[PDB]
Structures are given as C-alpha cells and as structure tokens.
Amino acid sequence: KRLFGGAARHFYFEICRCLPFIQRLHKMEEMVSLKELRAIVKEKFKEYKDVKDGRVVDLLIFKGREEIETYLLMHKQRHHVVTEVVEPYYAKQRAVKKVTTNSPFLDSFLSSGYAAIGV
Amino acid sequence: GYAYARKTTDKDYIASEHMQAFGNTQLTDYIIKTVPKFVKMAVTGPAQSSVLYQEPTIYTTPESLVPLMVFLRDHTNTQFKCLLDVTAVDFPERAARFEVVYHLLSPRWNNRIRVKVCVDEVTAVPTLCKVFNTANWFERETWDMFGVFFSGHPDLRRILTDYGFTGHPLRKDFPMTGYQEVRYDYGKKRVVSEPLELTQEFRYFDFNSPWETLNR
Amino acid sequence: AKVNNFTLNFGPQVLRLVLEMQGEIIMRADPHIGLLHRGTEKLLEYKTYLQGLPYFDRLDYVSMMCMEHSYVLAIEQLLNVSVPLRGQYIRVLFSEITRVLNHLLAITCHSMDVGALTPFLWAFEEREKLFEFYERVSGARMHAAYFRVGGVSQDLPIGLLRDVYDWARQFASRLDEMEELLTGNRIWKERTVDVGTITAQMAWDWGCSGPILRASGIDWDLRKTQPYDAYGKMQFNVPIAGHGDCYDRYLVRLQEMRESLRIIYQCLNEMPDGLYKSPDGKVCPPSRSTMKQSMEALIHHFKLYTEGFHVPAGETYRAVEAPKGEFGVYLVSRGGNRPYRCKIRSPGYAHLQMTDVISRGAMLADVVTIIGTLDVVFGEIDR
Amino acid sequence: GFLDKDSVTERVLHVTKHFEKIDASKVSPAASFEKDLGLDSLDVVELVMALEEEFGLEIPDAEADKIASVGDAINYICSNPMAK
Amino acid sequence: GTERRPGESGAWKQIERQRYASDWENDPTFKRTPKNLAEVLDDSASMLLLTDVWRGMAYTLGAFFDKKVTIMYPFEKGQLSPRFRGEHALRRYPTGEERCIACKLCEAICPAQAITIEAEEREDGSRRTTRYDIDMTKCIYCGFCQEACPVDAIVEGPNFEFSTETREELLYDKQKLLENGDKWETEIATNLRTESLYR
Amino acid sequence: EFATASADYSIAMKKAAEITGAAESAMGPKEGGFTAGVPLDTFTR
Amino acid sequence: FKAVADVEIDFNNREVLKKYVGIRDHLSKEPGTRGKLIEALTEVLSSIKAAPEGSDYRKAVEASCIYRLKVCKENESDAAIEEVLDAHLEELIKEAKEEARLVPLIAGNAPWDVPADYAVPVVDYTDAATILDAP
Amino acid sequence: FEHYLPMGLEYRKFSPGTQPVKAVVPHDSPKLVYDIKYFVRDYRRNNKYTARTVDAKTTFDFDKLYAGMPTKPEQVKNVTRPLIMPTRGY
Ligand SMILES: CCCCCCCCCCCC(=O)SCCNC(=O)CCNC(=O)[C@H](O)C(C)(C)COP(=O)(O)O
Ligand code: SF4
C-alpha cells in the first residue's frame, strides 16, 4: 500500500518525534519553529521520492539516521544547522519570483565565467 | 587460545615437517574438497607468512562467509584463531566494485590465509562480530571508508572521519582533497566549513612510459 | 535500586573517552578516535613507491624504521628482490635499536602517568644517545627514511659500531638503576598488579600481539616463528609471564629490552663486509659516482627518480614484529608505478578496541594505567 | 465525548488553515486527506503533528496511520480521555 | 623483587579471591607464608618500617650528588653529523655560475610537492631557471631532492636555527636560496668532501 | 591453444570479475550518486 | 623461554609449568588426561555421523580422529602425547570439543550439496627462480 | 656498575666529518663489473601465474596424509628455522 513498507513515513515520524529536543538543545527557539522545521525535513525527503530500489531506500534511511544522531549528540552546533539545513531552504524559496526581471542565465553571466561550485 | 609456552629450552625449529608440508601444499585442495559449496575461486600465491612459501586465497559468497569462517576457526586442521584485519579494495570497472578482504593467522601451525567477498555498493555483507571480536571496529572503518554495509552489526557508525562527514573517502571517484575545507570566522565566532579553494592546486605528474609492459 | 549509569567525558586534551560509572566502578568505555586521521591511505595512491615511503615514519613515530620495514618487505616480495647480507644485518641492528627506543618511552611514560617522574628523565638521555645513532646514519633524528627496497639507503659511517658498543656496554646498568625505583616498590605494585587482566583466549579473540601476548603465557614471537632478514641467525630468548597483568607486561617489556641488547651485541660482532644494496639497477638507484660517468646509470637514475620502478601485478600481506605488536601492510598492485591500494594494519588499533572489556570493574584512576599499558600511539591508530 | 464537537472542529480548521500546500477555502468539516485535499503520507504526518501541537497530546504511529480524514481526527481527539 | 602478596593486588576480584581461598599458594610467583619467628620479623620489617621506599630514596639521593647532562644553549651546542638535513640551499660552481640546469628531477621526486620550477633559455643559450620556489611549510625535510639532483645544486645544509615570526618569511624563492648557498658554501663543501665517499 | 597474458596475476583478476551473483549487480540511473554522499551539484557537470 | 619472575622455578615439574603460564587459571583448572582426550575424540567420532557417508568432510574428520586415537593408544604417558601432537593436553581436549561442536552448523549449512558438474578454478604461482636458477 | 656520561675522548673521539681513515665503499660486485647481462637475473619479470585445471574430480586421499605422520616422540621431525633470507650470493 505504501511502497517499501512505508519506511519513509516511519523515519519521518521518528525524526518529527526527535525534533523538539533538537530545538531545545540547540537553542533554536527564537530562530525557527517546529512547523517550519518539520516542513524542511519533509522537503529533504521528497528529493528521493523517485527511488525505485528498496536497498537504496534502506541505505538512505541509515545515513539519515546517522545524521540525526550526530545532531543529537552536539557534534554539530547551531551554526551548522544554519549553514546547512534552513538557509539553503530559505534561499530556494526566497529567490523565487525576484524583484528583477533578469533570467538566471544573465545573473550567472554577470557573476563569473563559470558556474558556482557548492554552496 | 593456543601457542602456550611449553618447551623450556630454546627451539631452533618452526613447525613440524608433516604439518608444514600440509599447510604449504595441500591446504587449498583440502578446503576445496571438504567444503566445496563455500569456495568459488582459489589463488595460491606469494605467502603472507614468509618470502619462501606459498599460501592460499579463498573466494566466497556473502551468503556463506560466516559458516566458512567458523569452519576455518574451529576445524582441527585449520585453526585460524586470529583475525588480523578486515578491509576493502575498489574496482570501478567491475559490476561488483568492492572486494572485502579478511586476513587470518593460525598460531597452532604457523599459517596464514586470505578470504575475499565481492559485493557492489548496495549488497550487505554479514558481520563477523560473533565469530571474531575485532571484526567490530574493522567493519566500522570499512563502512566509513568505502560505504560497505555490514548487516547484523551492533552499532555500525563512522569511526575515523569528521562528525558530519558524508561520503566515503577511499573510493576511486572521491577526490583526494575533498569538497569542503575548514577555517575560523571572526564574525560568526565559530569554526566554519566552506567550499574548497587552494592557493596552489595539486600538480598531477603522468610519468607512465608508452613502452612499459607490466601495466594491467 | 534502578541505578542509571553516570557518564563522563574524558579529555579533548588526542584521545576522547566516554565512560559510564555505577558509582566508583566503570561499566563501559567507548573511545572516540579520528582526531589524528589525516587520510594517509588515500594519499599513498597518489605517490610512487619511493615517494610514499616517508609516510610510514609518521605512523608509529616512536618506532620509525620498524614501520618502514613491512612496507619495504611487501614491495620486495612482489618485485622478487633479494637483499644482500650486510643490509640484512644493518636492518636487524637498527630494528633492535628502534625497539629499545620504543620500550624506553613506553615504560617511562606509563610510570609518569602513574606518578613516578624521575624514570622519564633518566631514560630520555639514553633516548638522546640512540637518536644520535639515527642521525649519524640518516641525517634525521626521527624520520630517517633509511630502509629502502633492496637494502638500506647509505652505508654505515666509519666509527658507528665503536660507539654503539660503548652505549651497549652501560645500557644494562641504566636498566638496572631504572628498576630500583619501580620493580620492588609497593605503590607501583598496588597500581599495576591484577589490573586489566588478559587471558590467552581473549588475547587471540581480540587480535592481540606483542608484549601483551607474551604476558598471558603465549610463546609467539614473529622474529622466531616467521623470521625475516637475519633474525633466524640471532640467538635470544622470549620472555614469558602468566598473569596477563600490567605488572607482568612491565616485566616482559624490561626483559625484551635486555634481549634487544643481546641481539644488538651479536650484530656488532658479525657485521660483514660487502654490498648494502641489491645490485638490481632497475630497482635500486646507482651510486652518485657511477651516475656521473656511465650512460646506463644516468638513464636509470633519471627514470627511477621520476617514474619509479613498476611493481608486477599481484597482492601480498607482510608483517613485522613491531615493538607494539604486529604491524602489517596489505599491498595491492595492478602493475603501475603507484600502489593501487595500501592497507595499513596497526596493533594499537586492535589493542585500543579492548578498553571496553578491560576497564570493566576498574576505577577512574586505573583507566590511565590501562591506556598506558596498551602502548598506543594515535598516528598508527588514526591513519 | 470528553470534549465538545464544535470548538475542536474549529480548532482543527484553524490549524489546517496555515498549510501552504492546502487551500484555505476547500477545507470542509468532513473531507479526506488523500482524494480531496491531495496529501501524501508525510503531509498527513505533518498535519497530525500540528494537531498534536494544538491539543497537547501524543498520537502513536499506528493511530496516526489510521487517521485519514478531518472527521477521523476530530473523532480521535474527542475519544481521547487526556485532551486539553 | 617481583614477588606477589595476598593483599597487594590492585583490583577487587583477586583481593576477594586471595582472602577466601588458598589458590595463591599454588602459584610460584607468590611469597610464601613465614614459618618461624625470624621470618615473621623479616616480613613485618618489610611491610612496616618500609625499606623498599628507602632503596629508591638512596638511589635518588645518589643521583642528587652525581653529574648532570644539561648543555647551556646557545653557548653550548649538541652534536650532529655531515649527513644532517637542515635548511635547503642552492649552490654555485667556483667560477660563480649556478649549478642548477632546470632538469626538474627534484620537483618530480618531492613527495610533498614543495618545489615549483619554471625555466626558459638564457640570453647566452644556457638552460637555467627563472623560478625556483621551496615552500618550507610544506617541506618534510626528507632529502630526496638532494638525492635526485645530478649536479649537486640543491642541498640541505647544516642550519637548523631559522625560525621566523611570519609565515611569508618561510616561502623561499630562488634569490634567497642562492643567498643561503653563498652564506653556507664552505661548510657544505667540507661536509660533501666526506659524504662523497659514501654516496 | 589459449595464451592471452597467461603468466601474471591478471588471470586471477579477469575471474573474480565473473563470479556468479556478483557479475550481475546493477543499479538504476543516478542511484549510486545518492548513496555516494558527495554534493549533488557535482553531477550537473 | 625466559621466565620474568626473579625467583627460581623448576619447570621440570609439568604442573608447575602449567600453573606458571596460566593454563590452570585461564583455560582449565581440572588437569587434562589421556582418558579425557580419548573420550572427547570418541565424542567427535559419534558427532560426525550426522554428516553423509560419502562426504569428504566426514572422511577428513574421521581420519583426523583416528590418527589422534592411534597416537593416544601407542603412547601411555601424557608427556609423550604432548611431544607428538605439539600442545598441552588441555589444548587438545579443547580442540576435540570444538571440532565436535562444529558439526551441527556445517551439517545445517550442507557444503557437500553441490551439483555433479561443480567446478572451482584455481590459479597457482610459479617463482622465477624455478626457470632462472640451477635445476 | 657502568657510569653514564663518559668523559673526554672516551666516546665519539672523532667527529663524523673528521674520520681518521678514508672509506672505500663497494657499490658493485666484482662478478658484475665486466659481465653485465641482465636477462639471466631478471627475477622481476620471470614469475608466472598458471590457471590450474579445474579442481573438481581430484582424489584427496586422507590415508596417505595421515600415513606420513609420526606416532612416537622420537621419529618426530621438525623444520629448522631459516638462518637468513636469500641473498643470491651478494
Ligand atoms: C536536524 C535535521 C537533520 C535531518 C536529517 C534527516 C534527513 C533524512 C532524509 C533522507 C531520508 C529519505 O529521504 S528516505 C527515501 C525516501 N524515498 C523512497 O523511499 C522511495 C519511494 N518514494 C517515497 O517513499 C516517497 O516518499 C513517496 C513517493 C512520496 C511515497 O508516498 P507516501 O509518503 O505517501 O508513502
Ligand atoms: S627535502 Fe624533501 S620536502 Fe624538502 S624540497 Fe627536498 S624532497 Fe621536497
């Protein structure tokens, strides 16, 4: 009924249960809310919505687990969450329909001769 | 638990003639004949123990790695009690690009052996934690460096790389210098990871002769 | 009652430990490593075989030439290269000098961690003498890069054996005055006796080697069971104890220093005259006078210092009785002038994995004794 | 019946209103999450987490997996003896 | 001595074992029970009144009245050899022409990639470098460049005292390396007159 | 007769590439980059 | 070997040697004898009957046990069996018990169940000194 | 009791740059000065790997293997430890 045992929604539920402790421990109470954090983590899951292999799904869930305990054990601080999780999301939803009529090509043209590498 | 101190005199000998002859000559055929379904390929080559001998290499499937290792530990003629390491080698040209390699030492008869399993990136290898207690950290390192998943491990987590490190560095398609680098920011008052920039890029010297015959 | 474990973080300042206690008694120890992981196994794939040799000095940097030995032997086996007699004797002599340096540092750092400060200061002057012996033959006090494929890099300078004999003539007196402070002392015994016991079955199940293995009643020395270079000619004893104690490992390490002195004395009297490098010019570089006078030598000098020799395709694992245990290199060759894969097996990596089962039932002041008696260096642990 | 069937309904509508992928006027007191509102499983989990945040409860994985409708959520909150 | 006692056991399982069972009497490394009065007095003079602390104290008091091994740097120095690998330097012929001929062998052998070389032909037709950099903060001081050089142009000299206050002072270019060679030439030649018998 | 580089370790490399079960490993498109863990913009090149 | 204890230990008494190296404390406090070795080897000979008669594994285990029992029969003292089989008898009894323990796991896995046309390629190594040095 | 710290000229009497006797280091064997042919000593490129015939219907006789083993303390034969690794005469 749900593809590959519904493991994506089970892992999403586990992370959503883990989330308020992350917000308290990393002191992100006045930076982001739990609703937008849940939406962001949901947006991390949709990027692999077209995986056709269950073993890739299991590996992705294992790797996402290891990411969530390295956030739980304070091995990455709040600035890591800022620079890796929520500002890429806000950049992907903030630049949409900008105040200028320049195409993405012309912004890339005026920036440099080559495409940007990384974030 | 073997090789207890028994002789109180100085020993000027290594092994006995019959057991050394059996180990250095007949062990490949013996392992193939006794447990044929476990063995898919064998190589007898230049001998981990010494420069003067030959020693076998056994290829097996992941479905029978644990029974073969239990047999090689507990059989009376092959008492391989010590597991020295677990590692992997990447062969990107193959359909299954990884070879997981197990080295063993027999203190009872001064022997060594090598055991190989071929898997790709998404096929799990059974853990040998219950057979050998050192298999834990070596499987953790192999998962860290190559991304080989060991099923049934108690706590498979990375052991060597950085805390947020995604990516398996010992693969052939991973760059030598990586993707990110680290510096201190005075404004954020934190040590921050940034995309890689090099003051002097790495110079790759291609030395290989177009007459050389040994390249395989 | 339902007593939860109290946990503790033990040192960022390069071992990190996460302990659990049930009062004053430890229930769990989890080492967190990788603070010295510099990725040397990846970097060796981008070097030629001569280029990657000084990486091995920086793995166990208390015992350098022994780390070089196994890499050189692994290359020599696949190349089918024979080492001449004088080079084998030089390699055995400097391997035993290296073992003496390592055991001096290990015992005195252990006794300083326990609390005795004077034996450290007494043993480091002897360490300075052996560093002068390293420098007189290689020009470096620590990272010598002395052992090469097919032999050693340079010959022994005239006057070295005279001074090695003069040091070896008084080293037993130094070891004697070292033991007067520690061996028959009740505080050292009460710190070391019956602490962190290892039986033989646990030693083989946990991949142990070296002086740990000999203190649990196992007669296993790689210099006597699978000998390499001229170690089969050497006459020495294997020290054996039977408790698996910190105290027994300390006694075994002192006796191993005595036996290394015996091998050093034997090498000083049987040093032969002859070649110290293999005469295969397609592997070993020529002499500097020969390179400046013959065309074939200059061609071989040019090619061996740029492309390097090509190792034939194959694989091997070669091990050496390093002063911390079995140090091994797994070399995988595809046929090029660069290693395809070079796995490094370190004994301290396997010895540190045991801290969860060795520290159970001990107290906080015995963790540092266990770490000191395992003889760990994090360069070889974190490659 | 531990709580009324009107105030819980408007509170459900109030927390359903602030969803960016939902329509603020299509939401009905008796609808479906799948056919009507067009939500997959993760959106359903997010909505149930919002309902849990508003009513101060804890809904397990199986119970939240059984909830597939606005009426189902209202009936589960009403049947819960620990509601606020 | 290396003997053991019931009571001097550092742990608890062995302490519990020695006081409830006599299995320690079978072990040959244990000290036996005293059998008469004089042996009891010897054991008590071992445990009480110390006498094992006193032997170490006598040794350290003998060391207090002994000779010392400290040198007074920088008025006194240590001992080194002509093979010592110190600060890199570039050399000349006795005429004053550079020995280096831009073969790029030392740049190829360098495992640290600490050497950067560019060259063209000089106005008299000679083959000479226009850039010869050594990153001393990348160098590993192996001496492989000294081995690879066929004209003895690059050496590691006998200087070890060259610590600076800025890191830009440790990125040597060609001119500074020639200045180092012009400073250290006589010592380098004296060292190489002995080390050419071996190399 | 058959002799195509039949005197070196490459014989033991050609087989071990055709071991059954491991000679038929296959993944879908772009799937190995998802599990590689390197940044995803690298595969736009 | 060299004993690190500064006391003088006989080591001709075999029980003292077994005490000193930790066999009594760490492996077996009960002394192993010739009869216990015979009993353990007959336990292996009984346990191996779960394997098929035509299997090479059964032939290998049976031949090893028969040789061990012949050594036990032709030697009365336990020092002679120590000198022949190159171990302590506690080690040999542990070996036989481990071999008997191994049999049900191998029998459950059934390695003998290969097809009739089963094939295993083997690659062997020949040194250069075979053809270069003197015959 | 041998004393640490020897006095003047009792240790390192000559510095290594002032060796009292000139050194003559051999760098080649006298057998190879005028006989320089290489293919008779090319050990690197003369090793072989051979694919064995497929190890299927071989006859492992365990009777012969256990018939060559001793049964008495005397008649036990031991392989002596090798004194040196091969030097090939150099
Ligand atoms: C502090 C922040 C740290 C966060 C780190 C954790 C991030 C983990 C993210 C990685 C985990 C995954 O993507 S797991 C991989 C998820 N993709 C798959 O499983 C392939 C099948 N597609 C699906 O399952 C889709 O969700 C769908 C088609 C909508 C099914 O519809 P429903 O949903 O109705 O069931
Ligand atoms: S001494 Fe070593 S690191 Fe320094 S320039 Fe020469 S080769 Fe490079």
Ligand code: SF4
């Ligand atoms: S210093 Fe020597 S090796 Fe380096 S480029 Fe100049 S001549 Fe060549």
